[PDB]
Amino acid sequence: NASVPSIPLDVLSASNSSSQLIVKWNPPSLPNGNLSYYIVRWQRQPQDGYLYRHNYCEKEEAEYRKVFENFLHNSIFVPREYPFFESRVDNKERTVISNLRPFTLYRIDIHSCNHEAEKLGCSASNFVFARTMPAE
Amino acid sequence: EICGPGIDIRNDYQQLKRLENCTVIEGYLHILLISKARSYRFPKLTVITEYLLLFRVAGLESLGDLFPNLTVIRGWKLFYNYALVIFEMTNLKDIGLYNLRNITRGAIRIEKNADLCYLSTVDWSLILDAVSNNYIVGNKPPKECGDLCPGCEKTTINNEYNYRCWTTNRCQKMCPSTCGKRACTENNECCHPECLGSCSAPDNDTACVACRHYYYAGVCVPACPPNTYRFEGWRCVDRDFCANILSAESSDSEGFVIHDGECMQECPSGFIRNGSQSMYCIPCEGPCPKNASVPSIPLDVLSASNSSSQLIVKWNPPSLPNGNLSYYIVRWQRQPQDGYLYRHNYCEYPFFESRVDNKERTVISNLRPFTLYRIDIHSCNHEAEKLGCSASNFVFARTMPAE
């Protein structure tokens, strides 16, 4: 049976420029199928709550497990508030995002699909946080 | 109802309704392959002898939904020495089994419950004995489950001390040292000593939820009355009851048999039925017809006192005998009563040495009553008299106090 890809591996990100971000990741541990594409999402995160207001100035277990397998072998299993910007990934586990708010924090979500995500759905996200370079 | 002689529940929760009238289950419970298309509650169930097994029960979020009052599992027989197994319970988030007061025999194994929280929020040492045998793997990562207890109560959980909870709304309920080894009712009212787990009234063997030893006619009892005999390991039945018991249908199927005061499906090995397959077993006399190195320290050296000025002591053969065991040589030393302590007003010791003949047991005499003693036992193989004797296996024990 086909399945949901693994989450992306080794999700890693940086900013090389103010208002710009670079992100790199690695292909999923188990594609379980041809990858189709990755989808990366990002959203402005608010700067942390409060903060603003305050003035800061021997073993045998395999024969055990077989017991659970033996009951299974009696039955088959047979498959038939700020806005997000978003972009799909065509190829690389790398993409670049621009016109970001300088020095703001963003969430980045990365999902890894496969050829069956049009039917199975795409994988859950592997995700990381990074900050853009401030507006020099 | 005494349900039985064995329960196998699979596929559908609509089949789970068999429990509506059950309160005791004779024999194991298996729960397999259930998938749902609801809440369920079975507070009538209170004690299971033997073990409970659940496997791939989709659609249950917490165990306190089904079996809140399930108070004792005896584990008289074990699944590979396990009395409870929970496997691949996708979606189970907590153990709200908050009346669970004892698991008598058996270890616990807990695998693949990837959403289970309240993992180590339960003091297993309160409810069951050799917790060191448990196996808890692949469940929701506690570092990321981030369990929580209200407040309730806490204990020295391994290297920690931490609050103990079944679920956010229910803790692992416990009894004070006024009951201690003995059970209690909710309000810390001590149960009857023949009782087990929670009680509907304190100190009454006729008001028990369960019995530690045996049950009969609404009475918790230590052993079967003379015309009553041990059955399974929890209740007594009369000579005629087992006389009604044809064993399980089998090529070797016969009536149950009574022996050593237990009524059992068949005689223990080395014993046979009297005469024409009689109700009682009898033993068969004979087979029934168809270089050195330094020894380890001794093992399991243990000792106690039954009298002032005396001690009794027992041990086990060493981990590595490294030879034929010859004998044991026992030493003992006075410890001081603990340092500091003495100075506040709250209102050089000799070794003895002696050499054992044969037993892992010996007696020591003329001690000061209530003084603490170190016993050092050195274990010397036939070449230890050249090699040097073993390091010690050791214990500290106290003489019974002088009144």
Coordinates of C-alpha atoms in Angstrom, one line a residue:
Chain A
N1 CA 0.0 0.0 0.0
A2 CA 1.1 3.6 -0.7
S3 CA 1.3 5.9 2.3
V4 CA 1.7 9.4 3.7
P5 CA 5.3 10.6 3.3
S6 CA 7.4 11.2 6.3
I7 CA 7.8 14.7 7.5
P8 CA 10.7 16.5 5.8
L9 CA 14.1 15.8 7.3
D10 CA 16.7 18.3 8.6
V11 CA 14.6 21.4 8.1
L12 CA 17.0 24.3 8.2
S13 CA 16.7 28.0 7.5
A14 CA 18.5 31.3 7.4
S15 CA 18.2 34.9 6.4
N16 CA 20.8 36.3 4.0
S17 CA 19.2 39.7 3.6
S18 CA 16.7 41.9 5.3
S19 CA 13.2 41.2 4.0
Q20 CA 14.5 37.9 2.6
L21 CA 14.8 34.3 3.8
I22 CA 16.5 31.2 2.6
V23 CA 15.3 27.7 3.7
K24 CA 16.9 24.3 3.2
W25 CA 15.7 20.9 4.3
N26 CA 16.3 17.2 3.5
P27 CA 14.1 14.6 1.7
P28 CA 11.9 12.6 4.0
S29 CA 13.1 9.5 5.9
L30 CA 10.3 7.5 4.2
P31 CA 9.0 8.9 1.0
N32 CA 6.7 5.9 0.7
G33 CA 6.4 7.1 -2.9
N34 CA 7.6 9.5 -5.5
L35 CA 7.8 12.9 -3.9
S36 CA 5.6 15.1 -6.1
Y37 CA 6.5 18.2 -4.1
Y38 CA 7.0 19.9 -0.8
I39 CA 4.8 22.7 0.5
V40 CA 6.4 25.4 2.7
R41 CA 4.2 27.8 4.6
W42 CA 5.1 30.9 6.6
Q43 CA 3.1 33.4 8.7
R44 CA 4.1 36.5 10.5
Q45 CA 4.2 35.7 14.2
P46 CA 3.5 38.5 16.7
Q47 CA 6.3 39.7 18.9
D48 CA 5.9 38.0 22.2
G49 CA 2.9 38.8 24.4
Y50 CA 3.4 41.3 27.2
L51 CA 6.9 42.6 26.6
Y52 CA 5.5 45.5 24.6
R53 CA 3.9 47.4 27.5
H54 CA 6.7 47.3 30.2
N55 CA 9.3 50.0 30.4
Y56 CA 12.6 48.2 30.2
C57 CA 14.5 51.5 30.0
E58 CA 18.0 -14.7 26.7
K59 CA 15.4 -12.5 25.1
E60 CA 12.4 -14.2 23.5
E61 CA 10.0 -11.3 22.8
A62 CA 9.8 -12.1 19.1
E63 CA 7.7 -15.1 20.0
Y64 CA 5.6 -12.7 22.0
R65 CA 5.1 -10.3 19.1
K66 CA 4.1 -13.2 16.9
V67 CA 1.1 -13.6 19.2
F68 CA -0.2 -10.2 18.1
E69 CA 0.7 -11.0 14.5
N70 CA -1.2 -14.3 14.7
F71 CA -4.5 -12.6 15.6
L72 CA -3.9 -10.0 12.8
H73 CA -3.2 -12.7 10.2
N74 CA -6.9 -13.7 10.6
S75 CA -7.9 -10.4 9.1
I76 CA -6.6 -8.5 6.0
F77 CA -5.9 -4.8 5.7
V78 CA -6.3 -3.4 2.2
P79 CA -6.5 0.2 1.2
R80 CA -8.6 0.7 -1.9
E81 CA -3.6 35.7 13.5
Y82 CA -1.3 37.3 11.0
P83 CA -1.6 36.0 7.4
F84 CA 0.2 33.1 6.0
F85 CA 2.0 33.5 2.7
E86 CA 2.4 30.1 1.0
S87 CA 4.4 28.4 -1.8
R88 CA 4.8 24.9 -3.2
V89 CA 8.2 23.4 -3.8
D90 CA 8.9 22.1 -7.3
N91 CA 12.2 20.3 -6.8
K92 CA 14.7 21.3 -4.2
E93 CA 14.5 21.0 -0.4
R94 CA 15.5 24.7 -0.7
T95 CA 13.4 27.8 -1.5
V96 CA 13.7 31.6 -1.0
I97 CA 11.1 34.0 0.4
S98 CA 11.2 37.8 0.0
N99 CA 9.6 41.1 1.0
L100 CA 9.4 40.0 4.7
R101 CA 9.1 42.4 7.5
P102 CA 12.7 43.2 8.6
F103 CA 13.6 41.8 12.1
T104 CA 10.2 40.1 12.5
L105 CA 9.9 36.5 13.5
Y106 CA 8.1 34.1 11.1
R107 CA 6.9 30.6 11.5
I108 CA 7.9 28.2 8.6
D109 CA 5.9 25.0 8.1
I110 CA 7.3 22.4 5.6
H111 CA 5.2 19.5 4.4
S112 CA 6.6 16.7 2.2
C113 CA 4.2 15.1 -0.3
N114 CA 4.3 12.1 -2.6
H115 CA 2.7 11.1 -5.9
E116 CA -0.2 9.8 -3.9
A117 CA -0.8 12.9 -1.7
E118 CA -3.4 13.9 -4.3
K119 CA -5.3 10.9 -3.0
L120 CA -3.6 10.1 0.3
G121 CA -3.1 13.7 1.3
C122 CA 0.3 15.3 1.9
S123 CA 2.5 14.6 5.0
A124 CA 2.4 16.5 8.2
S125 CA 4.9 19.3 8.5
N126 CA 8.4 19.4 9.8
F127 CA 9.0 22.9 10.9
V128 CA 11.6 25.4 12.3
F129 CA 11.8 29.1 13.3
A130 CA 14.1 31.8 11.9
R131 CA 14.3 35.6 12.0
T132 CA 14.8 37.9 9.0
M133 CA 17.8 40.3 9.0
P134 CA 16.7 43.8 10.3
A135 CA 16.2 46.7 7.9
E136 CA 19.7 48.0 7.5
Chain B
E1 CA -22.2 -12.3 37.9
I2 CA -19.2 -14.5 37.7
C3 CA -18.5 -14.3 34.0
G4 CA -16.3 -16.8 32.2
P5 CA -14.7 -19.3 31.5
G6 CA -12.9 -17.0 29.2
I7 CA -13.6 -13.7 27.3
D8 CA -12.4 -12.9 23.8
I9 CA -13.9 -9.6 22.6
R10 CA -13.1 -8.4 19.1
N11 CA -14.2 -6.2 16.1
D12 CA -17.1 -4.2 17.6
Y13 CA -18.0 -2.1 20.6
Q14 CA -21.6 -3.5 20.2
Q15 CA -20.1 -6.8 21.2
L16 CA -18.5 -5.2 24.3
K17 CA -22.1 -5.0 25.8
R18 CA -21.5 -8.5 27.1
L19 CA -20.1 -6.7 30.2
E20 CA -23.5 -5.1 31.2
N21 CA -24.1 -7.7 33.9
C22 CA -20.5 -8.8 34.6
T23 CA -18.8 -7.9 37.9
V24 CA -16.1 -10.6 38.1
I25 CA -14.3 -12.2 35.2
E26 CA -13.0 -15.7 35.5
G27 CA -10.0 -16.1 33.3
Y28 CA -8.2 -13.7 31.0
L29 CA -9.8 -10.9 29.0
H30 CA -8.6 -10.2 25.4
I31 CA -9.7 -7.1 23.6
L32 CA -8.8 -7.2 19.9
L33 CA -9.3 -5.2 16.7
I34 CA -12.1 -3.0 18.0
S35 CA -13.0 0.1 15.9
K36 CA -16.0 2.2 16.7
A37 CA -18.6 4.2 14.9
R38 CA -19.2 6.4 21.7
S39 CA -18.6 6.6 25.5
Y40 CA -19.0 3.3 27.4
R41 CA -18.9 2.6 31.1
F42 CA -18.6 -0.7 32.9
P43 CA -18.4 0.0 36.6
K44 CA -19.9 -3.4 37.5
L45 CA -16.5 -5.0 36.7
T46 CA -14.3 -4.8 39.8
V47 CA -11.8 -7.6 39.9
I48 CA -10.1 -9.6 37.2
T49 CA -8.2 -12.7 38.0
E50 CA -5.4 -13.4 35.6
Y51 CA -4.3 -10.7 33.1
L52 CA -6.0 -8.1 30.9
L53 CA -4.9 -7.6 27.3
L54 CA -6.1 -4.8 24.9
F55 CA -4.9 -4.5 21.3
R56 CA -5.8 -1.9 18.7
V57 CA -9.0 -0.6 20.4
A58 CA -9.6 2.5 18.3
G59 CA -12.1 5.0 19.6
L60 CA -11.2 5.0 23.3
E61 CA -9.6 8.3 24.6
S62 CA -9.1 7.4 28.2
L63 CA -9.6 4.2 30.3
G64 CA -11.6 6.0 33.0
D65 CA -14.4 6.2 30.5
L66 CA -14.9 2.4 30.5
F67 CA -13.6 0.8 33.7
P68 CA -13.4 3.4 36.5
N69 CA -14.2 1.0 39.3
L70 CA -12.0 -1.9 38.1
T71 CA -10.1 -2.1 41.4
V72 CA -8.0 -5.3 41.4
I73 CA -6.2 -7.5 38.9
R74 CA -4.8 -10.6 40.6
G75 CA -2.6 -11.9 37.8
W76 CA -2.7 -15.4 39.2
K77 CA -1.6 -16.4 35.8
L78 CA 0.5 -14.0 33.6
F79 CA 1.0 -13.3 30.0
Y80 CA 4.7 -14.1 29.7
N81 CA 4.9 -12.9 33.3
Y82 CA 2.9 -9.8 32.4
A83 CA -0.4 -9.1 34.1
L84 CA -1.3 -6.2 31.9
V85 CA -0.5 -5.5 28.3
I86 CA -1.7 -2.4 26.3
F87 CA -0.5 -2.3 22.7
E88 CA -1.0 0.1 19.8
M89 CA -3.7 2.1 21.6
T90 CA -3.8 4.9 19.1
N91 CA -5.8 7.8 20.6
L92 CA -5.7 6.7 24.2
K93 CA -4.6 9.8 26.1
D94 CA -4.8 8.9 29.8
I95 CA -5.4 6.2 32.4
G96 CA -8.5 7.5 34.3
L97 CA -8.9 4.1 36.0
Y98 CA -8.9 5.9 39.3
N99 CA -10.4 3.1 41.5
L100 CA -7.5 0.8 40.5
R101 CA -6.0 -0.1 44.0
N102 CA -4.0 -3.3 43.3
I103 CA -2.3 -5.5 40.7
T104 CA -1.3 -8.5 42.7
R105 CA 1.0 -10.7 40.6
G106 CA 2.7 -9.8 37.3
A107 CA 4.7 -7.1 35.5
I108 CA 3.3 -4.4 33.2
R109 CA 4.2 -3.9 29.5
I110 CA 3.1 -0.7 27.7
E111 CA 3.9 -0.3 24.0
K112 CA 3.0 1.9 21.0
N113 CA 0.4 4.0 22.9
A114 CA 1.7 7.1 21.0
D115 CA -0.9 9.5 22.4
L116 CA -1.0 8.2 26.0
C117 CA -0.3 10.8 28.7
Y118 CA -0.1 10.2 32.4
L119 CA 2.7 7.7 31.8
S120 CA 4.9 8.0 34.9
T121 CA 2.2 10.0 36.8
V122 CA 1.2 6.8 38.5
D123 CA 3.2 5.4 41.4
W124 CA 3.3 1.8 40.3
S125 CA 5.0 0.7 43.5
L126 CA 1.7 1.4 45.4
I127 CA -0.4 -0.8 43.2
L128 CA 2.0 -3.7 42.3
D129 CA 5.1 -5.4 43.5
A130 CA 8.1 -5.9 41.2
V131 CA 7.7 -2.7 39.1
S132 CA 11.4 -3.3 38.0
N133 CA 10.0 -5.9 35.6
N134 CA 7.8 -3.4 33.7
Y135 CA 8.4 -2.5 30.0
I136 CA 7.2 0.9 28.8
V137 CA 8.4 1.8 25.3
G138 CA 7.3 3.8 22.3
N139 CA 4.4 5.5 24.1
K140 CA 3.9 9.3 23.9
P141 CA 7.3 10.9 24.7
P142 CA 6.9 12.1 28.3
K143 CA 9.2 15.0 27.6
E144 CA 6.5 16.1 25.1
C145 CA 3.4 14.6 26.6
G146 CA 4.1 17.0 29.4
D147 CA 2.0 15.3 32.0
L148 CA 0.2 17.2 34.7
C149 CA -1.2 16.4 38.1
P150 CA -3.5 18.7 40.1
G151 CA -2.4 20.3 43.4
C152 CA -2.8 15.9 45.4
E153 CA 0.0 13.6 46.5
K154 CA 3.6 12.8 45.5
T155 CA 6.3 10.3 46.3
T156 CA 10.0 9.6 45.7
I157 CA 9.5 8.3 42.1
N158 CA 12.9 6.9 41.4
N159 CA 15.4 9.7 41.6
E160 CA 12.6 12.3 41.6
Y161 CA 9.8 13.1 43.9
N162 CA 6.7 14.0 41.9
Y163 CA 2.9 14.3 42.1
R164 CA 1.0 11.1 41.2
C165 CA -2.0 11.2 39.0
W166 CA -4.2 8.9 36.9
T167 CA -5.6 11.9 35.0
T168 CA -6.0 15.6 35.4
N169 CA -9.1 15.1 37.5
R170 CA -8.1 11.9 39.4
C171 CA -4.9 11.0 41.3
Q172 CA -3.6 7.5 42.2
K173 CA -5.5 7.2 45.4
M174 CA -3.7 5.9 48.4
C175 CA -3.9 4.9 52.1
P176 CA -2.0 6.3 55.1
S177 CA 0.4 4.3 57.3
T178 CA -2.5 3.9 59.7
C179 CA -3.6 1.2 57.2
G180 CA -0.3 0.8 55.4
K181 CA 0.2 -2.7 54.2
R182 CA -3.6 -2.9 54.7
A183 CA -6.1 -1.3 52.3
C184 CA -8.4 1.6 53.0
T185 CA -11.6 3.3 52.0
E186 CA -11.6 6.7 50.3
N187 CA -11.5 8.8 53.5
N188 CA -8.4 7.0 54.8
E189 CA -10.6 4.5 56.8
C190 CA -8.6 1.3 57.0
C191 CA -10.0 -1.8 55.3
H192 CA -10.3 -5.2 57.0
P193 CA -7.0 -7.1 57.0
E194 CA -8.5 -9.9 54.9
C195 CA -9.7 -7.2 52.4
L196 CA -8.0 -6.1 49.2
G197 CA -8.3 -2.7 47.5
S198 CA -11.1 -0.2 48.2
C199 CA -13.9 -1.0 50.7
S200 CA -17.5 0.1 51.0
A201 CA -16.9 0.1 54.7
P202 CA -13.7 0.1 56.8
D203 CA -12.5 -2.9 58.8
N204 CA -15.3 -5.2 57.6
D205 CA -14.6 -8.4 55.7
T206 CA -18.2 -8.5 54.6
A207 CA -18.0 -5.0 53.0
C208 CA -15.0 -5.6 50.8
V209 CA -14.6 -4.9 47.1
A210 CA -12.0 -7.7 47.0
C211 CA -10.1 -10.1 49.2
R212 CA -6.3 -10.4 49.4
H213 CA -6.4 -14.2 50.1
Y214 CA -9.8 -15.7 49.5
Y215 CA -13.5 -15.0 49.2
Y216 CA -16.4 -17.1 50.5
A217 CA -20.1 -16.4 51.1
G218 CA -19.4 -12.6 51.2
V219 CA -16.4 -13.2 53.6
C220 CA -12.8 -12.6 52.9
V221 CA -10.8 -15.5 54.4
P222 CA -7.2 -16.7 54.6
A223 CA -7.7 -20.3 53.6
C224 CA -10.5 -22.6 52.7
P225 CA -12.7 -24.2 55.4
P226 CA -12.3 -27.9 55.6
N227 CA -15.0 -29.0 53.1
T228 CA -14.0 -26.2 50.8
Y229 CA -10.9 -26.2 48.6
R230 CA -8.8 -23.7 46.8
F231 CA -10.0 -22.9 43.3
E232 CA -8.1 -20.8 40.8
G233 CA -6.4 -18.8 43.5
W234 CA -9.1 -16.6 44.9
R235 CA -12.2 -18.4 46.0
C236 CA -13.1 -21.7 47.8
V237 CA -15.5 -24.3 46.3
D238 CA -16.9 -27.5 47.9
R239 CA -16.1 -31.1 47.1
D240 CA -19.3 -31.3 45.1
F241 CA -18.7 -28.1 43.2
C242 CA -15.6 -29.6 41.5
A243 CA -17.6 -32.8 41.3
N244 CA -19.8 -30.8 38.9
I245 CA -16.7 -29.6 37.1
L246 CA -15.8 -31.6 34.0
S247 CA -12.6 -30.0 32.9
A248 CA -12.3 -28.3 29.4
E249 CA -13.2 -30.6 26.5
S250 CA -10.0 -32.2 25.4
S251 CA -8.5 -35.6 24.7
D252 CA -7.2 -35.5 28.3
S253 CA -10.5 -34.0 29.6
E254 CA -11.5 -35.4 33.1
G255 CA -13.1 -33.9 36.1
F256 CA -11.1 -31.4 38.1
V257 CA -9.1 -32.9 41.0
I258 CA -8.4 -31.7 44.5
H259 CA -4.9 -31.9 45.9
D260 CA -3.0 -29.9 48.6
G261 CA -6.4 -28.5 49.2
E262 CA -6.5 -26.9 45.7
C263 CA -9.1 -27.9 43.1
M264 CA -7.2 -27.9 39.8
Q265 CA -7.7 -29.0 36.2
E266 CA -5.0 -31.6 36.6
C267 CA -2.6 -33.0 39.1
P268 CA 0.8 -31.3 39.4
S269 CA 3.7 -33.3 37.8
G270 CA 4.7 -36.2 40.0
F271 CA 1.2 -36.6 41.3
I272 CA -1.7 -38.7 39.9
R273 CA -5.4 -39.2 40.6
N274 CA -6.4 -41.9 43.1
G275 CA -7.8 -45.0 41.5
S276 CA -10.3 -44.8 38.7
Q277 CA -9.5 -41.1 37.9
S278 CA -10.6 -40.1 41.4
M279 CA -11.3 -36.6 42.6
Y280 CA -8.1 -36.4 44.6
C281 CA -4.5 -36.6 43.5
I282 CA -1.8 -38.8 45.1
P283 CA 2.0 -38.6 44.6
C284 CA 3.8 -41.2 42.5
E285 CA 6.7 -42.7 44.3
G286 CA 9.3 -42.8 41.5
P287 CA 8.4 -41.5 38.0
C288 CA 4.7 -41.6 37.3
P289 CA 3.7 -44.2 34.7
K290 CA 2.9 -43.0 31.2
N291 CA 41.9 -22.9 37.4
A292 CA 39.8 -21.3 40.2
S293 CA 39.4 -17.6 40.6
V294 CA 38.4 -15.2 43.3
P295 CA 34.7 -16.0 44.2
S296 CA 32.0 -13.5 43.8
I297 CA 30.5 -12.0 47.0
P298 CA 27.7 -14.3 48.2
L299 CA 24.3 -13.4 46.8
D300 CA 21.2 -12.2 48.5
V301 CA 22.6 -12.1 52.0
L302 CA 19.7 -11.3 54.3
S303 CA 19.1 -11.3 58.0
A304 CA 16.6 -10.4 60.7
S305 CA 16.0 -10.6 64.4
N306 CA 13.4 -12.5 66.3
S307 CA 14.8 -12.0 69.8
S308 CA 16.9 -9.5 71.7
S309 CA 20.6 -10.4 71.7
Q310 CA 20.1 -12.7 68.7
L311 CA 20.0 -12.6 64.9
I312 CA 19.0 -15.0 62.1
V313 CA 20.6 -14.7 58.7
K314 CA 20.1 -16.2 55.2
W315 CA 21.9 -15.8 51.9
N316 CA 22.3 -17.2 48.4
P317 CA 25.1 -18.8 46.5
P318 CA 27.4 -16.3 44.7
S319 CA 26.8 -14.8 41.2
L320 CA 30.1 -16.4 40.1
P321 CA 31.1 -19.4 42.2
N322 CA 34.3 -19.6 40.3
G323 CA 34.7 -22.9 42.0
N324 CA 33.2 -25.4 44.4
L325 CA 31.8 -23.4 47.2
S326 CA 33.6 -25.0 50.1
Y327 CA 32.1 -22.9 52.9
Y328 CA 31.2 -19.4 54.0
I329 CA 33.1 -17.3 56.5
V330 CA 30.9 -14.7 58.2
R331 CA 32.1 -11.5 59.8
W332 CA 30.0 -8.8 61.6
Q333 CA 30.8 -5.3 62.8
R334 CA 29.0 -2.8 65.0
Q335 CA 27.9 0.3 63.2
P336 CA 27.4 3.5 65.2
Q337 CA 23.9 4.9 65.3
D338 CA 23.8 7.5 62.5
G339 CA 26.1 10.5 62.7
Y340 CA 24.9 13.8 63.7
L341 CA 21.4 13.0 65.3
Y342 CA 23.0 12.5 68.7
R343 CA 23.9 16.1 69.4
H344 CA 20.4 17.6 69.6
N345 CA 18.0 17.3 72.5
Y346 CA 14.6 17.0 70.9
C347 CA 12.6 17.4 74.1
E348 CA 36.9 0.7 66.8
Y349 CA 34.1 -1.8 67.0
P350 CA 35.5 -5.3 66.7
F351 CA 34.9 -7.6 63.8
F352 CA 33.9 -11.1 64.8
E353 CA 34.7 -13.8 62.2
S354 CA 33.4 -17.3 62.0
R355 CA 33.4 -20.0 59.3
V356 CA 30.2 -21.7 58.0
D357 CA 29.9 -25.4 57.4
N358 CA 27.1 -25.8 54.8
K359 CA 24.0 -23.7 55.0
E360 CA 23.4 -20.3 53.5
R361 CA 22.0 -19.7 57.0
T362 CA 23.5 -19.1 60.4
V363 CA 22.7 -17.7 63.9
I364 CA 24.7 -15.0 65.9
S365 CA 24.3 -14.5 69.6
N366 CA 25.0 -12.3 72.6
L367 CA 24.5 -9.0 70.8
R368 CA 23.4 -5.8 72.5
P369 CA 19.6 -5.5 71.9
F370 CA 18.6 -2.8 69.4
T371 CA 22.1 -2.1 68.4
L372 CA 22.7 -1.9 64.7
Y373 CA 25.1 -4.4 63.2
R374 CA 27.1 -4.8 60.0
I375 CA 27.5 -8.4 58.9
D376 CA 30.3 -8.9 56.5
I377 CA 30.3 -12.3 54.7
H378 CA 33.3 -13.4 52.7
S379 CA 32.9 -16.3 50.3
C380 CA 36.0 -18.4 49.8
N381 CA 36.4 -21.1 47.2
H382 CA 38.6 -24.1 47.5
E383 CA 41.5 -21.9 46.3
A384 CA 40.5 -18.7 48.1
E385 CA 42.9 -20.0 50.9
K386 CA 45.6 -19.2 48.3
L387 CA 43.8 -16.7 46.1
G388 CA 42.4 -14.7 49.0
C389 CA 38.7 -14.8 49.8
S390 CA 36.0 -13.0 48.0
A391 CA 34.9 -9.5 48.6
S392 CA 32.0 -9.3 50.9
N393 CA 28.4 -9.4 50.2
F394 CA 26.9 -7.4 53.0
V395 CA 23.9 -6.2 54.9
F396 CA 23.1 -4.1 58.0
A397 CA 20.6 -5.5 60.5
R398 CA 19.3 -4.8 63.9
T399 CA 18.7 -7.0 66.9
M400 CA 15.2 -7.0 68.3
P401 CA 15.0 -4.3 71.0
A402 CA 15.2 -4.9 74.7
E403 CA 11.9 -3.7 76.3

